[PDB]
Amino acid sequence: NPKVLVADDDKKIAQFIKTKFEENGIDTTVAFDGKEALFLINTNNYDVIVIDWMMPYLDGISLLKILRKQNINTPVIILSALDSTENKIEGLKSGSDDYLTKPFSIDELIIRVNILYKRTK
Amino acid sequence: NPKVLVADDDKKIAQFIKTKFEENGIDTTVAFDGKEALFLINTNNYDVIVIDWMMPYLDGISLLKILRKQNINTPVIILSALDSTENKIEGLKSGSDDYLTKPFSIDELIIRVNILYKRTK
Ligand SMILES: [Ca+2]
Ligand SMILES: [Ca+2]
Ligand SMILES: [Cl-]
Ligand SMILES: [Cl-]
Ligand code: NA
Ligand code: NA
Ligand code: NA
Ligand code: NA
Numbered sequence: 001n002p003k004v005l006v007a008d009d010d011k012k013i014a015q016f017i018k019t020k021f022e023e024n025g026i027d028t029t030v031a032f033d034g035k036e037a038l039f040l041i042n043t044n045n046y047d048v049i050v051i052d053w054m055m056p057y058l059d060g061i062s063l064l065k066i067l068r069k070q071n072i073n074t075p076v077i078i079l080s081a082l083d084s085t086e087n088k089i090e091g092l093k094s095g096s097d098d099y100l101t102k103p104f105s106i107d108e109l110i111i112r113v114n115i116l117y118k119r120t121k
Numbered sequence: 122n123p124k125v126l127v128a129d130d131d132k133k134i135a136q137f138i139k140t141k142f143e144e145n146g147i148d149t150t151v152a153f154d155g156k157e158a159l160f161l162i163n164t165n166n167y168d169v170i171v172i173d174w175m176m177p178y179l180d181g182i183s184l185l186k187i188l189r190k191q192n193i194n195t196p197v198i199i200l201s202a203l204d205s206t207e208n209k210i211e212g213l214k215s216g217s218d219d220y221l222t223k224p225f226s227i228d229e230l231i232i233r234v235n236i237l238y239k240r241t242k
Contacts, residue, residue, distance in 0.1 A: 054203070082175070086178070
């Protein structure tokens with residue numbers, strides 16, 4: 001099973017994602033803000049990381065930039081309310097492997113998680 | 122009259138702000154994205170600058186950081202949908218003189234424009 005971290009402060013959305021991921025073959029840990037996410041990412045191995053764009057302590061893009069500075073190169077998917085092409089490009093340049101605008105498709109998110117897991121062996 | 126630039130890509134909100142400002146004694150120029158705002162700020166003198174948090178080409182915080190790097194110290198008010206205290210603090214540390222969460226009060230915005238104009242003689 002892919003091992004994935006999901007970081008969002010919206011507990012309903014986080015629970016929804018976790019339920020759908022574990023329905024499929026994806027073992028999922030939830031972090032409810034950027035501080036907990038940073039800690040978990042630095043003390044556990046994940047195959048893919050799914051990060052919401054806005055949470056307490058560290059927003060998603062800021063956490064991603066910290067990770068890439070730390071030479072943590074785990075595949076990252078950003079979930080963001082900033083839906084312009086310019087903001088998608090900024091998220092990708094910041095080091096994300098994909099960038100899904102909200103409202104997002106859970107089916108697409110699961111497929112992209114699996115694609116990234118397959119690519120990173 | 123205070124001379125003020127208002128930057129937002131939402132034309133209805135920009136027009137509303139301009140109407141209320143000019144009703145009061147505030148001469149107002151509108152810029153509809155961050156590129157036009159940057160150009161106008163570098164080619165005109167303004168007493169106060171009101172910047173929306175998200176627009177094409179340059180978001181409000183990024184424009185503010187560019188301005189403060191350029192040693193342009195004109196008072197800036199940020200209008201933002203990011204309403205947590207943490208995000209307000211980040212906006213202030215980025216160089217803004219005030220930070221109003223949306224939905225904002227036009228009456229408060231006018232009063233704060235006038236306070237900043239009075240303080241900068
Ligand atoms: Ca969130
Ligand atoms: Ca806007
Ligand atoms: Cl956007
Ligand atoms: Cl917020
Ligand atoms: Na499981
Ligand atoms: Na932040
Ligand atoms: Na006028
Ligand atoms: Na930006």
